[PDB]
Design a protein around this ligand. Structure first.
Ligand SMILES: [Zn+2]
Lengths: 282, 94, 69, 58, 191, 286, 159, 48, 49, 70
């Protein structure tokens, strides 16, 4: 009997992640859900090419919350657009609950896996995904028969599935007992990276725009006053050092103050001088 | 005519050119500022006028070529200083 | 979820409510009900998740007014 | 810095007063205000050191 | 019978301003597309119908859709304040026919021209060739102006029906009685 | 109308996905869709978009297809998903505007009166051109010129809200970023600014070449804005600006003496401590 | 395929190469690892332009990651012990966008310069190991130092 | 359970008090009939 | 329907230009920020928010 | 990478944070905080915090989702 490998990965597309995050935040504090489009490239790869949201329903996030008519028209009409991808799986946002499946979630996932054996049930936490960490996990299931007979839910052939550790929260809510966490990998090609880099690419202008000279002088005065006080603290600490065998330092704070003054002042001088040269009447 | 090399124009220039008395250069400058064509200022002490004006004109294709050459000069100055800073900072640019 | 409407504030009316989960809540828009009678104390059924007034329900009792039949 | 960052993402542990170590594996502990639970003790902590009315972290 | 996506080319030009049919040539086109789309939809329930304007631009107000009520309502308030252009209209019809939803649907459009087309025979014949390469089978019906079935139109027919090809019938409508029976006797039996 | 148009780093990815999914076989090189978003009589932000089936033919650039009931249906579906975004404008790749842009804008002005073209540049991402957003205006060409439409440029920004910008960061987190500005990164920024200035210079020079020889018509407002900009250049002469030596040397006070001498003293202090520490380590060892 | 490659290791026979290329072109993940490894083994140290071109092209064309790993190790083994002859491929795989191909480049650096102690190869490996953005490529680059420096093991812990 | 909200089979909701937790207006399950529910009695209610 | 309701509380202190100590009614206290377009000069201590 | 890690540590000090009372210190890096939400937690002290100002019943701000003494 074939068993899904522990090296199986869910290649979440970049825009798939973006849409999931935006829709999850929009639904806060309610729970949202949507369908995940892509293709099962092989037994060790699930490529979530795209995702489309689903209308918020009074049921919540269940298998009655998937509108068959809405699902249909969206599927045929996206196929017309140029996205003829089979529905890979579904997603729903647990706002602040962490990533796991509640009993209704496993019920809906069973409904989904009735359609196809390979079908994931990724979830995302829209509020715990603060700047930096993104709290998203992908679980498929554990069939009861495989577990009760004692066989491990997934065969192992590599360390890929053991690189990351399952969390206590998910573990208590049935992880590794009713469903397994599938490692999530983000397909991000160079083009999308370069385009995303424009979000904080400032301009060709601020590289030549001088900071306000009055504000520059006030910042410099404040920093040199702080350097005063830090230097007095340094002198007192060093005077103590002599009456001290090996047994906040004014020195470090002084050092990063020096570094900030360095960068700000040198940049201002150099920028002003380039502005003198290139921005010339001639 | 004078490409800001010597902006300060003595009242003799405006008097002979505009065929006016030096008593009236100030008046016509004030009128031109009031209507909204020029935004300069007058120095009566040294008999000079400072001009920083924002009124353009049609530009006489030969003048298009001349301004093209001026643009070329300033752009090659920009390029030269860009190579200079790049070469001097190649250690830091990485 | 039933909530005791503490008071109505003008902004065009916004209400602060004390839901039965000992929690106060400000509502920029007064749910899906009219907003004229809305006595400051009128018990309403506020939404369990989004906390807006879906409907008004008749007042329960006022201590002695039920202590007196 | 990275290890501190990792350890800062883990949830804080509730404190609780152990009523009594029921068994060499279970401990009756009261945690304010969720109530009284009978927790188990992990690999590191040895049961015999858990004395009644001492503060523990769950 | 056959699955198709109809792309009707309605003219609201100013050369449409003709009294060849009794009330109004434009209204003649309106009730003519009404009756022909009624016949086509009733012939095959799953067929698709659409609308194109040819006046001073190709407005595509209704594209290849099965519902007839909304295209019907688009016929009203058509505001005939333009100038006809047959070539770009048929080009837009062809590209819409390429962008149909169901692949099994055999391409089909209904074209009603009641204005003298101002063009050159060479572009017309090359366009007939281009539509022939894509196996797009049109029907064309001459309304309006007295130059009914002009040599341009006959060339279009005999080239699109290359050696009795697709079946762009040269059905002739008199500059007088463009009657509904005169507009249903030929097409509902054949094309 | 709108003094700024904000494009979230989601519609950008939507356009890239549409362009890829088409250009798998769709060598049209330009694809047109509808972009939604919260609509303000102030700065406009684009929060979402979808792709409509668009066809264009290279013949005369006047025969094209845009399934508008598809537009309405997808907008209804988005309303069901999120009624907050309303149809705002549209997008297409192929940075060179075609002839059907204005006609498509007129087509789409019915669903929203203030429709704005938002072009997305996909392949060319060299220096400073992530997008360009345009809006049609109702003026013939100028005070005394014949009729045209002349899409108007609007300043565009790439801005994200919370829970979308975090997805961008997680998609990022290569050797890139480093939001704090180190001296190295700031000098690199200055170099990039010089490069961008030079590129814009070459662009304007190229247009002036095209006009001077008569290949391109003289456009009067263009020439006027030229004369203004070369009038606006400053003068490093006029020795009152040159008295910026004052502030240059004032800066040299805080950079040259204070922080540099403090750094030198700190480094020496770190040195001597090691020299004692090494000496003490040696003594502990004869 | 694993058995064929390992038995015919380095023989550079053409019939086995063609059969295994057919199996690789059958485009399946489970057999793709074996196909790529077997191409690496059969044409081991051969420097053949045909095999390397076909394998790199397939690695740039396919979608299955297992095939990617197999082709990576295969590209590594095809250029075994070729020393500076492999610099073109090494650069071409270092500049590849796919991290798996960068790992293949690191493995090729290891195999081509196995035991040479080439300072340029060590420099490239260390730069990649401290600079690359993919963890697997860093790991491969830093492990390749073992193959590079095995002939001088006493200098090896120092680095 | 508290006041029947004057149900009349079109307002089957009742305000119910789950001890120190909040109070909720809730509709019946299909397995129970309104004749079996009146004010003031203890009733078992689901979580969902 | 698109609205979500809001907590209420009293501002306790102005830690800095942006960070405010705010105590929710019959609940915990937090340090919170303020909306971008708001009259910070109006947010005195004790102001119900 | 050090600059990036410092940025992450600084960002973990963002808002909103729940107020709590620093009950007692346990280790050099962990402490027991009584959160104003009415519960007591055994949480982790941020390294950058000056230990000397960490006095009993000193009001401390805790991370919203981890209660770490931020
Ligand atoms: Zn769930």
């Amino acid at each position: 009997a074939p068993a899904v490998d522990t090296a199986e990965q869910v290649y979440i597309s970049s825009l798939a992640l973006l849409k999931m995050l935006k829709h999850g935040r929009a639904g806060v504090p309610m729970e949202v859900m949507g369908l995940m489009l892509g293709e099962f490239v092989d037994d060790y790869t699930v490529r979530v090419i795209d995702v489309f949201a689903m209308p918020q329903s009074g049921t919540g996030v269940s298998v009655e919350a998937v509108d068959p008519v809405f699902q249909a028209k969206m599927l045929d009409m996206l196929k017309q657009t140029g996205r003829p991808e089979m529905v890979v799986g579904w997603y729903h946002s647990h706002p602040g609950f962490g990533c796991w499946l509640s009993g209704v979630d496993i019920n809906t996932q069973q409904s989904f896996e009735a359609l196809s054996e390979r079908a994931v049930a990724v979830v995302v936490d829209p509020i715990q995904s603060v700047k930096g960490k993104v709290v998203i996990d992908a679980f498929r299931l554990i069939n009861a028969n495989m577990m009760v007979l004692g066989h491990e839910p997934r065969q192992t052939t590599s360390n890929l599935g053991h690189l990351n550790k399952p969390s206590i929260q998910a573990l208590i809510h049935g992880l590794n007992r009713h469903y397994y966490s599938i490692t999530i990998n983000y397909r991000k090609n160079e083009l999308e990276q370069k385009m995303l880099l424009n979000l904080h690419k400032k301009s060709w202008m601020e590289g030549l725009t001088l900071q306000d000279y009055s504000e520059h002088c006030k910042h410099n005065e404040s920093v040199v006053k702080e350097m005063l006080e830090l230097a007095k603290n340094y002198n007192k600490a060093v005077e103590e050092e002599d009456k001290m065998t090996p047994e906040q330092d004014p020195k470090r704070h002084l050092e990063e103050h020096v570094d900030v003054l360095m960068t700000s002042n040198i940049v201002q001088c150099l920028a002003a001088m380039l502005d003198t040269v290139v921005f010339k009447l001639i | 005519t004078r490409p800001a090399n010597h902006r300060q124009l003595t009242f003799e220039e405006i008097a002979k050119s505009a065929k006016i008395t030096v008593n009236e250069v100030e008046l016509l400058v004030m009128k031109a500022l009031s209507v909204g064509l020029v935004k300069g200022s007058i120095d009566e002490v040294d008999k000079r006028v400072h001009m920083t004006w924002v009124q353009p004109r049609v530009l006489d294709l030969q003048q298009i070529k001349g301004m093209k050459d001026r643009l070329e000069f300033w752009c090659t100055d920009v390029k030269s200083m860009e190579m200079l800073v790049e070469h001097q900072a190649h250690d830091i640019l990485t | 979820l039933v909530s005791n409407v503490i008071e109505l504030l003008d902004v065009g009316k916004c209400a602060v409510i004390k839901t039965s989960t000992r929690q106060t809540y400000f509502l920029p828009v007064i749910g899906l009900v009219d907003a004229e009678k809305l006595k400051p104390g009128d018990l309403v059924g506020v939404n369990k998740d989004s906390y807006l007034i879906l409907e008004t329900l008749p007042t329960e009792y006022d201590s002695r007014v039920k202590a007196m039949e | 810095l990275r290890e501190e960052l990792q350890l800062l993402q883990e949830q804080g542990s509730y404190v609780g007063e152990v009523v009594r170590a029921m068994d060499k594996k279970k401990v009756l502990v009261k945690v304010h205000p969720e109530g009284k639970f009978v927790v188990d003790v992990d690999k590191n902590i040895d049961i015999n050191d858990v004395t009644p009315n001492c503060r523990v972290a769950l | 019978m056959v699955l198709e996506s109809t792309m009707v080319c309605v003219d609201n030009s100013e050369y449409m301003r003709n009294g060849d049919f009794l009330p109004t040539r434009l209204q003649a086109q309106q009730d003519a597309v009404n009756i022909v789309c009624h016949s086509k939809t009733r012939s095959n329930p799953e067929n698709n119908v659409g609308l194109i304007t040819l006046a001073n631009d190709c407005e595509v107000l209704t594209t290849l859709t099965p519902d007839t009520g909304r295209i019907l309502s688009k016929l009203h308030t058509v505001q005939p304040k333009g100038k006809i252009t047959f070539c770009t209209g048929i080009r837009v019809a062809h590209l819409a026919l390429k962008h149909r939803q169901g692949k099994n649907h055999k391409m089909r459009i209904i074209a009603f021209v009641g204005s003298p087309v101002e063009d050159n025979e060479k572009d017309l014949v090359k366009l007939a060739k281009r539509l022939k390469k894509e196996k797009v089978n049109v029907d064309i019906i001459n309304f309006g102006e007295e130059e009914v079935n002009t040599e341009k139109l006959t060339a279009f027919v005999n080239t699109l029906n290359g050696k009795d090809g697709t079946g762009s019938h040269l059905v002739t409508v008199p500059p007088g009685p463009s009657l509904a029976d005169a507009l249903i006797s030929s097409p509902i039996l054949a094309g | 109308a709108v003094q700024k148009v904000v494009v979230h780093p989601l519609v950008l990815l939507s356009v890239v996905d549409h362009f890829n999914r088409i250009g798998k076989v769709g060598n049209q090189k330009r694809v047109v869709g509808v972009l939604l978003g919260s609509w303000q009589k102030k700065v406009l932000d684009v929060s979402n978009s979808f792709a409509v089936p668009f066809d264009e033919d290279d013949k005369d650039d006047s025969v094209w297809f845009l399934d508008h009931d598809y537009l309405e249906n997808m907008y209804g579906m988005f309303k069901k998903v999120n009624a907050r975004e309303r149809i705002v404008g549209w997008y297409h790749t192929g940075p060179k505007l075609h002839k059907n842009d204005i006609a498509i804008n007129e087509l789409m002005k019915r669903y929203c009166p203030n429709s704005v073209l938002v072009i997305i540049d996909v392949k060319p991402k060299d220096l400073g051109l992530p997008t360009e957003a345009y809006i049609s205006v109702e003026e013939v060409h100028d005070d005394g010129t014949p009729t045209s439409k002349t899409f108007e440029h609007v300043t565009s920004e790439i801005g994200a809200e919370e829970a979308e910008e975090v997805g961008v960061e997680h998609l990022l987190r290569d050797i890139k970023d480093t939001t704090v500005g180190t001296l190295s990164q700031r000098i690199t920024n200055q170099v990039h600014g010089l490069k961008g200035l030079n590129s814009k210079l070459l662009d304007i020079r190229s247009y002036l070449e095209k006009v001077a020889t008569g290949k391109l018509p003289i456009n009067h407002q263009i020439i006027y804005q030229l004369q203004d900009v070369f009038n606006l250049l400053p003068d490093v002469s006029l020795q009152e600006f040159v008295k910026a030596f004052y502030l240059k040397t004032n800066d040299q006070m805080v950079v040259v003496y204070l922080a540099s001498l403090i750094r030198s003293v700190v480094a020496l202090h770190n040195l001597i401590n090691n020299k004692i520490a090494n000496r003490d380590a040696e003594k502990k060892e004869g | 395929s694993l058995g064929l490659g390992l038995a015919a290791m380095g023989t550079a026979r053409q019939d086995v190469y063609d059969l295994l290329k057919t199996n690789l072109y059958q485009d399946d993940a489970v057999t793709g690892e074996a196909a790529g490894l077997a191409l690496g083994l059969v044409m081991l140290g051969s420097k053949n332009a045909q095999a390397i071109e076909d394998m790199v092209g397939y690695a740039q064309e396919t979608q299955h990651e297992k095939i990617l790993r197999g082709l990576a190790v295969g590209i590594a083994l095809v250029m075994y012990g070729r020393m500076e002859e492999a610099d073109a491929l090494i650069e071409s795989l270092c500049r590849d966008k796919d991290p798996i191909l960068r790992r293949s480049g690191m493995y090729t650096v290891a195999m081509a310069y196995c035991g040479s102690g080439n300072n340029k190869a060590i420099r490239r490996l260390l730069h990649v190991a401290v600079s690359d953005v993919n963890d697997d490529v860093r790991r491969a680059a830093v492990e390749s130092l073992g193959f590079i420096l095995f002939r001088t093991p006493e200098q090896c812990p120092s680095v | 359970c508290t006041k029947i909200i004057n149900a009349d089979s079109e307002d089957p909701k009742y305000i119910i008090n789950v001890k120190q937790f909040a109070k909720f207006v809730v509709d019946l399950s299909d397995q129970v009939a309104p004749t079996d529910i009146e004010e003031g009695m203890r009733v078992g209610v689901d979580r969902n | 329907l698109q609205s979500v309701g809001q907590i209420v509380g009293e501002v306790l202190k102005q830690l800095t230009e942006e960070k405010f100590i705010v105590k929710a009614t019959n609940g915990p206290r937090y340090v919170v920020g303020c909306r971008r377009q708001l009259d910070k000069s109006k947010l005195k201590p004790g102001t119900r928010v | 990478e050090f600059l990036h890690a410092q940025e992450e540590v600084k960002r973990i000090q963002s808002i909103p944070l729940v107020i709590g009372q620093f009950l007692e210190a346990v280790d050099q890096n962990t402490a027991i905080v009584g959160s104003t939400t009415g519960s007591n937690y055994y949480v982790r002290i941020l390294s950058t915090i000056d230990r000397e100002l960490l006095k009993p019943n000193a009001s401390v701000a805790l991370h919203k989702h981890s209660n770490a003494l931020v």
